[PDB]
Ligand binder design. Structure first.
Ligand SMILES: [Mg+2]
Ligand SMILES: [Mg+2]
Ligand SMILES: [Mg+2]
Ligand SMILES: [Mg+2]
Ligand SMILES: [Mg+2]
Ligand SMILES: [Mg+2]
Ligand SMILES: [Mg+2]
Ligand SMILES: [Mg+2]
Ligand SMILES: [Mg+2]
Ligand SMILES: [Mg+2]
Ligand SMILES: [Mg+2]
Ligand SMILES: [Mg+2]
Ligand SMILES: [Mg+2]
Ligand SMILES: [Mg+2]
Ligand SMILES: [Mg+2]
Ligand SMILES: [Mg+2]
Ligand SMILES: [Mg+2]
Ligand SMILES: [Mg+2]
Ligand SMILES: [Mg+2]
Ligand SMILES: [Mg+2]
Ligand SMILES: [Mg+2]
Ligand SMILES: [Mg+2]
Ligand SMILES: [Mg+2]
Ligand SMILES: [Mg+2]
Lengths: 166, 84, 97, 122, 201, 246
RNA sequence: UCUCCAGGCAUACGCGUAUAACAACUCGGAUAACCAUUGUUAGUUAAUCAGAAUAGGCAAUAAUCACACUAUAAAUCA
RNA sequence: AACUAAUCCUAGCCCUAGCCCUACACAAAUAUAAUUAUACUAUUAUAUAAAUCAAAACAUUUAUCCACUAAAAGUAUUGGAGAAAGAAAUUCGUAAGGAGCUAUAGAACUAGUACCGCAAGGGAAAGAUGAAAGACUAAUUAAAAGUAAGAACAAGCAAAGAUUAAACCUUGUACCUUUUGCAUAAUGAACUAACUAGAAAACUUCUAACUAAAAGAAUUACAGCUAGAAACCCCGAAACCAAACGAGCUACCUAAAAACAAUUUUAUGAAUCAACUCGUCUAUGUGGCAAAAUAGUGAGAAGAUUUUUAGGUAGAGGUGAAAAGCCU
């Protein structure tokens, strides 16, 4: 057990100078001991990464997976504790900066078998962490153009040196 | 307050016999009330009363047994009431 | 492996306590005292190994000799088995013959 | 697979197995499987008349309790029998044979309430 | 039980059941054993704080947990906490006293405000009394309300309560007759049958 | 083949009251409240025994109130006498300066968030209000020159607790910041004139008691305070499919 | 309400609260709803159902619808 | 920028020394199917310890197992005179601590409890805030394997020499044990943490004390004698003997009982065929519903029949319509 994602929500930064850029807000929320697999939960967490909170609260609602409702709840708690206790002006000015699922404490039980034999069953739990950062979703990755691809090849050749000699 | 052992000694056997039944009816009522509290899942009013009554009844038992025990020693001298 | 995350408490030894200060006194009681008492007589320990040393098999047999008749049944049984194990080891095993 | 740790009671076992829960017997089983209750074996509660009783379950706090002195055989003897013997000794009308005059009981046999062995319950 | 820690809450309260569950195995507290005669601190005695946050401030003992060698003084060594906290409301901030060990406080001379050490000694009547080591003087036991909270003098007789005079009344007559034999004579029961011989063994 | 197994131990993990509270609500329990063996200690009482209704036009008086206080002193004369009996040093004329010291000193602690200093300066009733809403928040506060001298408005003693009300019109500068240092409320540095009534009370019975800041009376004619910088949405009713808006 | 399946109610031996309602939603049911799970409170009422005095004397003749009918393996306290 | 986790100190324990004991627990109940208030039928240890093991087998035999220290002395004696065993006479003596353990350690122990076996019996695991919780239970840590943060990009025991460059280019037949001193063999290892195997002083060497003498009584000596230091592991059978515990499974028997419709023969270890008993064949299953079942198909079904309840026979034995079959 180690609950550090809970403490990070309490960090206090020093006041800014009159012309410093306005620091974007960060929120740290999670839920523990969820009756779900961490491997199954990752697909839901991976999906929402890099999206807004009104664009991640829509994709989740129409997913059949059980975890979709669980994540949606902690994406609404995060969306409320940001506006009330972290000074976020607009509900629609957030985006999921990070989101991942972690292993929890499990329980060991006996799964019976057919010849007086058995195997060890584990009832699986997990945790799920999310960070929300105030600001529109960073623009997506732009694929390298053909010109950019060609430039790297030339740059690679330009770096060539005469090896193993003065 | 509950009856102390010394005070009961001053009373005669007649009062001890009468007092026991007075306490007995009190104990039944508190046992009746305490049990009813469990059914209603509500705290019993003044739960301390039962302890006082029970302690009083024990004191009456102590006094009567002591009086009888002394008489046996004088007449017979046997330490215990039952053969063994 | 894992190691302590904090320093253990400091251990302080008083080297001038009565037991340490007077340690060794009367070790020459015999030669300086007209040999009235042998220094071995000053040892505090089990009755069967005051002023005596031997290997475990000898130690086992010596414990039996002094207090064999005052020992508990289970302790005596274990001692007897301990002797028989040592006997077969020291008298029938080992690299050298 | 039998539970060894639970108490052996009459609810368990076959129909034939039976035992009491501690209730005192009050009758006799005669021949032909007929029960015959005995009135004397049935306890009778001697209940006093509580009219005019000045004692209640609880006592006033103001009333001060006294020093506890467990009654002893010597103390009872001094209170009851010693004064009679002391006065009789001065008068000279005392003899070893007539200790019963002061209340001595040579044997408990013949007493309704035998001191030892006790033949009466609480 | 070997693993039972005495705290500040009175034993058997909801707090003490919560703190000490049956499976608790907390590290034992080591307490300098103090003889019943040795102990000289009693509820209501004014004492002075030798060291701590409020060192040098005199207070009144209001609780003594002898199992922990603790003495609690009113309004001193006091930290802050919230009482009556609810989901709707924060609660009321109050200042809560903390326990002090005996060696951190001293008793006070009755006449003069000073931390005078005392010794136990008998009197002419024989009653044990505390006497100051210096400026030998009798410090009386401080009268304090009882824990149950019942006040004797103001207590008013009510139904189910015997009068003081009635309790004091004595009617026991020393006689060599059992209760089983006095009741029958008083109640007029007559029985002429006698139990048959019984073979005890 | 062989066979051996282990038990699923019940493992109750509730070692704390927060864990126990969940346990007793799920498990169910009769938790009878108890009469505290030792009564709790109160160094202050929430509220004012007699609140002095502020007089309309008190700002227009730009002596003056002090004369009015003299007429109102007769109402508070009984309270003043009680202070003399237990203190004998309290002075109505000199209290403003002392009270002024407490007010300025207390608000300064906020700058450094010195909880220990505040507890001495303010009462147990005052402390939770000032500090509770300023957790994880930096507050910059200074004292600009006072516009007018302070006077003692009213004093009341009930029990035994004595409460003193002081009129304070002083210019101040306050700027609150978020955790991230962004600015909410107030202004970086601009003098603002503030008129308020502050209640100072002391425990007459306790030997170690002292005058502290308990509460501030707010008048109805007070002008609205500075509005917060950020815009806020007052949400609308949340309606189930059954319900309909009106 | 509809569709379809076809060992069911008691007794004994056994088991020992798994019974019933309420409340919870950690654990158990191999998933859910719901509880068989957790906690609290209750429960199964009998003269008929069921279970738990002495000393002598003396018995040739089955059962099977017991009549017919035969047989052989020769067959229940009063 | 963290999940899983890790850190921790006292609970008790170990070996000695001293010391015989006089801790035999209200009231009630228990030898009846223990813990059921009263009569029935009454109540009582054991003939010599064996074997393993050693004698490189085994058959006589085999220290301890099975009467004060040191010396005489490993001497006299005994012994398939082998392994081995081993005296006495006679001398001598007044006798509370820890270079121990600290939660996989120390006792099995938080407990002879849970759990397992019909029974005898076998037998665990774990805990961790602070002065105060009548201060919203602390802390502390890039720290194990495992994951996440952050899937991958021709080519190869995964590396090394390198290089401007992570990969391309060059060089290179996993480890241990084991076989011959060879493996592309053959054994053993998914990984992490903790635990887990060389021990004795006759002879020798080295170092000192005194020295025809050495040794704090008995010993050795034609330079010796005394003291010191210096040495020889771990895990694993099939078995053998003693004494308890088992016939609620199963073989057999005693006693008290129960079930058998319809049809045809007749008057029955006869016939057709259910209930019921059994288990010829095929198929599926194969960690299975099942540590022997399921679906079909088959055999008997008034008898040497099946079933129920209680009791008896116990391992050098019991039982056996003999399969060396059964006896949880
Ligand atoms: Mg099975
Ligand atoms: Mg697995
Ligand atoms: Mg139910
Ligand atoms: Mg329900
Ligand atoms: Mg299943
Ligand atoms: Mg239930
Ligand atoms: Mg009947
Ligand atoms: Mg051999
Ligand atoms: Mg052989
Ligand atoms: Mg252990
Ligand atoms: Mg263990
Ligand atoms: Mg790691
Ligand atoms: Mg390569
Ligand atoms: Mg392998
Ligand atoms: Mg071996
Ligand atoms: Mg049988
Ligand atoms: Mg057979
Ligand atoms: Mg038929
Ligand atoms: Mg068969
Ligand atoms: Mg056929
Ligand atoms: Mg046929
Ligand atoms: Mg037939
Ligand atoms: Mg054959
Ligand atoms: Mg078997």
């Amino acid at each position: 057990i180690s609950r550090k994602w809970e403490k990070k929500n309490k960090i206090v930064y020093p006041p800014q100078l009159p012309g410093e850029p306005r620091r974007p807000a960060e929120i740290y929320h999670c839920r523990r001991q969820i009756k779900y697999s961490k491997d199954k939960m990752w697909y839901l967490a991976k999906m929402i990464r890099g999206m807004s909170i009104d664009q991640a609260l829509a994709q989740l609602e129409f997913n059949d997976k059980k975890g979709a409702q669980i994540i949606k709840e902690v994406l609404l708690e995060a969306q409320d504790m940001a506006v009330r206790d972290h000074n976020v002006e607009f509900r629609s000015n957030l985006h999921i900066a990070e989101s991942t699922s972690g292993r929890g404490q499990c329980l060991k039980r006996i799964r019976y078998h057919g010849r007086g034999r058995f195997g060890i069953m584990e009832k699986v739990y997990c945790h799920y962490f999310v960070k929300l950062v105030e600001g529109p979703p960073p623009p997506p990755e732009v694929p390298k153009t053909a010109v950019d691809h060609a430039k790297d090849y030339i740059q690679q050749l330009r770096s060539r040196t005469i090896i193993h000699t003065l | 307050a509950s009856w102390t052992c010394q005070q009961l000694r001053n009373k005669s056997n007649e009062d001890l016999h009468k007092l026991w039944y007075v306490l007995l009816k009190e104990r039944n009522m508190l046992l009746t009330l305490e049990q009813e509290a469990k059914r209603q899942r509500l705290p019993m009013p003044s739960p301390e009363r039962l302890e006082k009554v029970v302690d009083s009844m024990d004191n009456v038992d102590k006094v009567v047994q002591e009086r009888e025990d002394a008489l046996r020693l004088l007449q017979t001298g046997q330490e215990k009431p039952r053969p063994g | 492996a894992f190691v302590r995350l904090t320093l253990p408490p400091p251990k302080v030894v008083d080297r001038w306590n009565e037991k340490r200060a007077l340690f060794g006194v009367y070790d020459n009681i015999g030669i300086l005292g007209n040999f009235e008492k042998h220094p071995k007589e000053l040892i505090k320990g089990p009755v069967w190994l005051r002023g005596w040393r031997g290997n475990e098999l000898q130690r086992c047999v010596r414990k039996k000799k002094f207090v064999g008749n005052r020992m508990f049944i289970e302790d005596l049984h274990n001692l007897n088995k301990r002797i028989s194990y040592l006997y077969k080891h020291f008298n029938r095993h080992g690299k050298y013959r | 697979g039998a539970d060894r740790m639970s108490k052996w009671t009459s609810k368990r076992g076959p129909r034939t197995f039976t035992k009491s829960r501690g209730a005192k017997k009050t009758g006799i089983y005669t021949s032909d499987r007929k029960f015959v209750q005995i009135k004397e074996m049935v306890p009778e509660f001697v209940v006093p008349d509580l009219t005019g009783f000045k004692l209640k379950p609880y006592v006033n706090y103001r009333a001060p309790a006294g020093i506890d002195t467990p009654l002893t055989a010597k103390a009872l003897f001094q209170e009851t029998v010693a004064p009679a013997i002391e006065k009789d000794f001065k008068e000279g009308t005392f003899d070893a044979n007539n200790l019963e005059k002061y209340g001595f009981e040579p044997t408990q046999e013949g007493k309704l309430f035998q001191l030892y062995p006790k033949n009466f319950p609480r | 039980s070997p693993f039972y820690r005495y705290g500040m809450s009175r034993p058997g309260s909801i707090a003490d059941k919560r703190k000490n569950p049956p499976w608790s195995r907390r590290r034992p507290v080591v307490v300098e054993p103090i003889s019943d005669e040795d102990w000289h601190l009693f509820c209501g005695d004014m004492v002075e704080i030798l060291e701590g946050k409020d060192a040098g401030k005199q207070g009144k003992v209001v609780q003594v947990v002898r199992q922990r060698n603790w003495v609690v003084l009113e309004g001193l060594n006091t930290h802050y906490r919230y009482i009556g906290r609810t989901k709707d409301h924060r609660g009321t901030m109050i200042a809560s006293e903390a326990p002090l060990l005996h060696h951190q406080v001293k008793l006070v001379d009755p006449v003069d405000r000073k931390p005078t050490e005392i010794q136990w000694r008998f009197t002419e009547a024989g009653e044990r009394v505390r006497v100051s080591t210096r400026s030998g003087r009798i410090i009386p036991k401080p009268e304090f309300p009882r824990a149950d909270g019942i006040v004797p003098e103001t207590w008013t007789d009510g139904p189910k309560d015997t009068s003081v005079e009635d309790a004091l009344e004595r009617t026991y007559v020393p006689r060599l007759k059992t209760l089983e034999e006095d009741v029958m004579e008083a109640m007029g029961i007559q029985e002429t049958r006698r139990f048959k011989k019984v073979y005890w063994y | 083949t062989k066979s051996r197994f282990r038990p699923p131990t019940p493992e109750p993990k509730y070692k704390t009251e927060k864990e126990f509270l969940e346990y007793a609500r799920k498990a169910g329990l009769v938790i009878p409240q108890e009469r505290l063996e030792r009564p709790i200690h109160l160094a202050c009482t929430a509220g004012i025994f007699d609140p002095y209704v502020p007089p309309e036009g008190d700002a227009r008086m730009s002596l003056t109130q002090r004369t009015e206080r003299l007429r109102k002193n007769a109402a508070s004369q009984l309270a003043i006498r009680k202070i003399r009996e237990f203190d004998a040093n309290f002075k109505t004329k000199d209290f403003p300066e002392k009270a002024k010291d407490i007010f300025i000193e207390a608000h300064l602690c906020l700058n450094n968030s010195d909880h220990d200093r505040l507890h001495t300066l303010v009462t147990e009733h005052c402390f939770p209000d000032m500090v509770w809403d300023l957790k994880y928040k930096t507050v910059r506060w200074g004292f600009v020159e006072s516009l007018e001298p302070a006077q003692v408005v009213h004093v009341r003693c009930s029990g035994m607790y004595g409460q003193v009300t002081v009129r304070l019109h002083t210019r101040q500068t306050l700027a609150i910041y978020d955790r991230f240092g962004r600015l909410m409320y107030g202004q970086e540095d601009v003098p603002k004139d503030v008129l308020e009534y502050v209640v100072f009370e002391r425990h007459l019975m306790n030997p170690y008691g002292s005058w502290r800041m308990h509460a501030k009376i707010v008048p109805a004619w007070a002008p609205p305070k500075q509005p917060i910088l950020k815009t806020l949405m007052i949400p609308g009713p949340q309606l189930k499919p059954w319900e309909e808006y009106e």
